[PDB]
Amino acid sequence: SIAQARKLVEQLKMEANIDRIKVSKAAADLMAYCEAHAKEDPLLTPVPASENPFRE
Amino acid sequence: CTLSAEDKAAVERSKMIDRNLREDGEKAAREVKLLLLGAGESGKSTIVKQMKIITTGIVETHFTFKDLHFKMFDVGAQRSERKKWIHCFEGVTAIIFCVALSDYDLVLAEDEEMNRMHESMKLFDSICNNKWFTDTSIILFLNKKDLFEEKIKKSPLTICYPEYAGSNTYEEAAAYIQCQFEDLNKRKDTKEIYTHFTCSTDTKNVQFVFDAVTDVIIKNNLKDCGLF
Amino acid sequence: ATCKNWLAAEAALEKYYLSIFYGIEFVVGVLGNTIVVYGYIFSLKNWNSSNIYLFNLSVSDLAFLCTLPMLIRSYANGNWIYGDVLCISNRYVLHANLYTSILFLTFISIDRYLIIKYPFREHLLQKKEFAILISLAIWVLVTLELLPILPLINPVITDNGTTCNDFASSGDPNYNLIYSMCLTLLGFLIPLFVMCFFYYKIALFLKQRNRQVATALPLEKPLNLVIMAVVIFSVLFTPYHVMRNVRIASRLGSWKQYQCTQVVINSFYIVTRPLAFLNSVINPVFYFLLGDHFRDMLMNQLRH
Amino acid sequence: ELDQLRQEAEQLKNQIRDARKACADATLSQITNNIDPVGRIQMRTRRTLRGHLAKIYAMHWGTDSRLLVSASQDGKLIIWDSYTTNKVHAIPLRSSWVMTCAYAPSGNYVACGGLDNICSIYNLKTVRVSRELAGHTGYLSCCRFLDDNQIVTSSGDTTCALWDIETGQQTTTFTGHTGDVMSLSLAPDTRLFVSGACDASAKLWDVREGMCRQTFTGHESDINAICFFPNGNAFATGSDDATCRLFDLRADQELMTYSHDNIICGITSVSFSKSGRLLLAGYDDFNCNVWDALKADRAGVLAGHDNRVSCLGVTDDGMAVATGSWDSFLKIWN
Numbered sequence: 001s002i003a004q005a006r007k008l009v010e011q012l013k014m015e016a017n018i019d020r021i022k023v024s025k026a027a028a029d030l031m032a033y034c035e036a037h038a039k040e041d042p043l044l045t046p047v048p049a050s051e052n053p054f055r056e
Numbered sequence: 057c058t059l060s061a062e063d064k065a066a067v068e069r070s071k072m073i074d075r076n077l078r079e080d081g082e083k084a085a086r087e088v089k090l091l092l093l094g095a096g097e098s099g100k101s102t103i104v105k106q107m108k109i110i111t112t113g114i115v116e117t118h119f120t121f122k123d124l125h126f127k128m129f130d131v132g133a134q135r136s137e138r139k140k141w142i143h144c145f146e147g148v149t150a151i152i153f154c155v156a157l158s159d160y161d162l163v164l165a166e167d168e169e170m171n172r173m174h175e176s177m178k179l180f181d182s183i184c185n186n187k188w189f190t191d192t193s194i195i196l197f198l199n200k201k202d203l204f205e206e207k208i209k210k211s212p213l214t215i216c217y218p219e220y221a222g223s224n225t226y227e228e229a230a231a232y233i234q235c236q237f238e239d240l241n242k243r244k245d246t247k248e249i250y251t252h253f254t255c256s257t258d259t260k261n262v263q264f265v266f267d268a269v270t271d272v273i274i275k276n277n278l279k280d281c282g283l284f
Numbered sequence: 285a286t287c288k289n290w291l292a293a294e295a296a297l298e299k300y301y302l303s304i305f306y307g308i309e310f311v312v313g314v315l316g317n318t319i320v321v322y323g324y325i326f327s328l329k330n331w332n333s334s335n336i337y338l339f340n341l342s343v344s345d346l347a348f349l350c351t352l353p354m355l356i357r358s359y360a361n362g363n364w365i366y367g368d369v370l371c372i373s374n375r376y377v378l379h380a381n382l383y384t385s386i387l388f389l390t391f392i393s394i395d396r397y398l399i400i401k402y403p404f405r406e407h408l409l410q411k412k413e414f415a416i417l418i419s420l421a422i423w424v425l426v427t428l429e430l431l432p433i434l435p436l437i438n439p440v441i442t443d444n445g446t447t448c449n450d451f452a453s454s455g456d457p458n459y460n461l462i463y464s465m466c467l468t469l470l471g472f473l474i475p476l477f478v479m480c481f482f483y484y485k486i487a488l489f490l491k492q493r494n495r496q497v498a499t500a501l502p503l504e505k506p507l508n509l510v511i512m513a514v515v516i517f518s519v520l521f522t523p524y525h526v527m528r529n530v531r532i533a534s535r536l537g538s539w540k541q542y543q544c545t546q547v548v549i550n551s552f553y554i555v556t557r558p559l560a561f562l563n564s565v566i567n568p569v570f571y572f573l574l575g576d577h578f579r580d581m582l583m584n585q586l587r588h
Numbered sequence: 589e590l591d592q593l594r595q596e597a598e599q600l601k602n603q604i605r606d607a608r609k610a611c612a613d614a615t616l617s618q619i620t621n622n623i624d625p626v627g628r629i630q631m632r633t634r635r636t637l638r639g640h641l642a643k644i645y646a647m648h649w650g651t652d653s654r655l656l657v658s659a660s661q662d663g664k665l666i667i668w669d670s671y672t673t674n675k676v677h678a679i680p681l682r683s684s685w686v687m688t689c690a691y692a693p694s695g696n697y698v699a700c701g702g703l704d705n706i707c708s709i710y711n712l713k714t715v716r717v718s719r720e721l722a723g724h725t726g727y728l729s730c731c732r733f734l735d736d737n738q739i740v741t742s743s744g745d746t747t748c749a750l751w752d753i754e755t756g757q758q759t760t761t762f763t764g765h766t767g768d769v770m771s772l773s774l775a776p777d778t779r780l781f782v783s784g785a786c787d788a789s790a791k792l793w794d795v796r797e798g799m800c801r802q803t804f805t806g807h808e809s810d811i812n813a814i815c816f817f818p819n820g821n822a823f824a825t826g827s828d829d830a831t832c833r834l835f836d837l838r839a840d841q842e843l844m845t846y847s848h849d850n851i852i853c854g855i856t857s858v859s860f861s862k863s864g865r866l867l868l869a870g871y872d873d874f875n876c877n878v879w880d881a882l883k884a885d886r887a888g889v890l891a892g893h894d895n896r897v898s899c900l901g902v903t904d905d906g907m908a909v910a911t912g913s914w915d916s917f918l919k920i921w922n
């Protein structure tokens with residue numbers, strides 16, 4: 001098929017021109033984000049009672 | 057133990073909602089749900105018209121015969137992967153599987169060297185021994201009789217099955233086909249298959265469906281009571 | 285004359301037969317009923333009327349069986365070593381559970397009916413509330429029925445003697461006979477007739493539906509089970525109720541003891557006593573473990 | 589010519605693979621080697637919503653952390669109140685085959701869909717079918733409100749669509765998948781979104797256009813769930829492969845795989861925990877598993893259901909997690 005192969009080639013060519021950052025520069029960012037919001041996660045560090053909505 | 061006006065109003069609303077939900081559930085628990093299946097165009101069009109009194113996906117039909125309200129779900133317009141939505145039909149009472157007898161010496165238009173009877177057998181095998189359906193009964197409708205009967209002569213059944221060794225009479229060719237379809241059941245100890253050579257232009261299909269459904273219901277009730 | 289041997293036979297039949305049979309029944313019934321109850325508790329949900337009735341029957345069987353261990357120490361030591369209050373409580377609970385089991389069986393038979401007629405549970409008596417209401421009514425009615433047994437069950441205490449007399453061998457034989465006949469009529473004959481009637485109707489339905497269907501598996505197993513239930517109930521219960529009244533009437537005013545005959549009758553009553561208790565052991569199997577559904581589910585939940 | 593294009597496509601694929609391989613100097617398992625473990629995560633069932641009469645297929649929270657909407661295959665869509673066990677709304681559907689739910693960010697509307705190939709939008713006024721969008725040719729499998737007048741739907745005909753609720757017209761169509769699309773997730777800024785399909789692949793689409801910017805592969809089977817990392821730089825994938833996989837947009841490759849030898853069931857949903865340090869995945873074995881997203885270590889297990897876990901959701905504040913199931917039970921854990 002000369003109609004679908006052209007679209008596939010165009011799509012493949014359009015995705016190979018993207019700039020990529022080195023790995024270990026994106027894992028560091030994930031680690032930093034996880035570290036900077038540690039105290040705002042009630043599931044990681046549970047909040048004391050009288051602050052939990054479903055204490056009951 | 058103190059409650060405000062707003063809290064009491066909310067509780068009253070929740071109780072009314074729950075009451076309506078229970079009423080709806082009890083009302084909908086008295087309906088028989090059947091799943092209509094078929095390969096290609098074996099039927100599902102004359103069957104539905106014969107049984108109805110009251111690509112868009114599921115198509116739903118109501119009808120009552122003596123005291124039972126049947127809902128039939130035709131899902132032949134779903135040209136999607138059958139593996140990702142079949143489990144929605146796990147609790148249906150029975151599966152009505154339609155197979156056309158005349159499609160024993162024809163091939164699919166989109167692909168040759170492929171009998172339609174073999175495709176129907178493949179689909180029946182896949183659905184009968186499929187999970188989610190280890191305790192669901194099947195009503196097999198062998199449609200398009202009197203055209204296979206008059207087409208059997210001058211066109212031997214060996215075109216479909218090259219092993220058949222017998223006369224060309226309709227009375228035994230039909231029995232051979234029915235047995236070949238019934239032999240695909242690998243759960244003979246937990247499932248039943250009701251077969252009907254449904255070329256009855258009268259109201260004989262609805263009667264057969266009613267009888268099979270009542271038998272299924274009685275067997276289920278006896279099973280739940282310890283008897284079977 | 286010709287009944288000294290009868291006396292020895294009666295003594296041995298009281299001392300050994302009753303103890304061994306009661307022990308065997310205790311162990312087997314306790315095992316089965318405990319299995320059934322724990323299967324119903326932490327393994328089954330969506331309770332319906334039939335489940336309520338069956339659970340009540342199992343509870344009654346277990347309660348009846350709990351009264352046996354204190355009766356097996358006796359018949360071996362030759363006397364009742366516990367307090368009079370304990371004796372009265374033991375016999376009262378034994379009889380109350382014995383006569384509650386019958387009503388629960390009758391209502392199970394009635395519930396088997398009303399499901400061939402109303403397969404969608406669309407009847408008033410099939411509501412889960414009516415089941416519990418009727419269970420409470422049954423318990424209270426049986427307790428009220430057994431209330432007038434207290435005067436007779438009163439124990440015997442005298443010089444160098446502390447013995448508990450069974451129901452048939454206590455109190456005034458006239459009032460005792462009248463009460464025994466009333467208890468028989470109210471607690472055995474009427475429930476038996478109701479059960480027989482409803483099971484006969486169910487069997488007729490099964491026979492009519494079996495021979496007028498398409499080519500399908502016949503309804504032969506349920507008919508056999510329906511017949512077996514009635515057969516077992518009648519066989520296990522009738523001789524005991526006949527012999528109890530015969531013995532009670534044997535020691536009335538017009539005895540005449542023409543051939544010291546009041547030894548054979550007591551022996552027959554003793555032999556028939558432990559047969560009736562066999563229903564408590566049998567019921568678990570017949571009503572729960574004979575069905576593939578319940579045993580399969582219980583095993584699956586036992587595997588955790 | 590056919591070969592002139594096939595060879596070019598193969599060359600482009602090889603070049604892309606080599607370019608993305610020559611970028612993995614390290615891995616997200618050596619950097620986090622010294623990171624201390626999160627420990628043992630233990631949660632208790634705080635609430636049990638008990639209204640549905642059949643299997644539950646979808647669930648959503650809404651930007652309030654109080655009310656949530658649940659859909660079951662009994663023709664009912666129930667809006668609850670988490671802090672209590674009250675029912676605020678119960679909507680009867682025209683079709684009882686529903687596989688999706690959505691709560692508007694403003695709380696005014698809700699949406700549903702299923703085997704009828706139609707997306708129905710109900711107006712809560714905070715009850716009445718406000719709109720019915722019908723342009724797909726396959727069962728809907730997901731839907732997410734972008735605004736009060738925009739919605740993104742995904743269908744089993746291997747396509748996604750961006751609609752216009754006011755007029756009902758299909759504003760844009762996203763194509764490229766070669767299989768049913770089973771999930772989609774909106775980026776926090778609602779400028780891009782990812783979709784996972786049954787061809788064992790995921791794609792990143794720009795909402796303002798109709799072009800796929802990146803394609804991520806590596807799963808060995810269908811993908812049933814998708815989730816975005818809280819900062820919108822990465823995403824999570826749930827599949828039957830029993831291999832939870834984290835991928836990055838900027839690096840354009842896979843980072844970590846979450847799997848165990850004793851797990852053989854497929855994953856039916858995934859979700860994060862407001863910080864990206866925990867990944868909660870629902871399984872077919874009635875269990876939910878909490879993984880340490882930075883170390884790929886199973887932190888904990890939630891087991892309170894008995895038929896399956898078809899829907900999992902975390903409160904916006906990560907205060908609690910609602911878990912609906914085919915057992916018609918919505919369990920809220922904290």
Ligand SMILES: O=C(O)[C@H]1O[C@H]1C(=O)O
Nearest residue numbers: 375378449450451452557
């Ligand atoms: O026969 C027994 O010893 C027990 O049934 C109790 C009684 O009749 O006293």
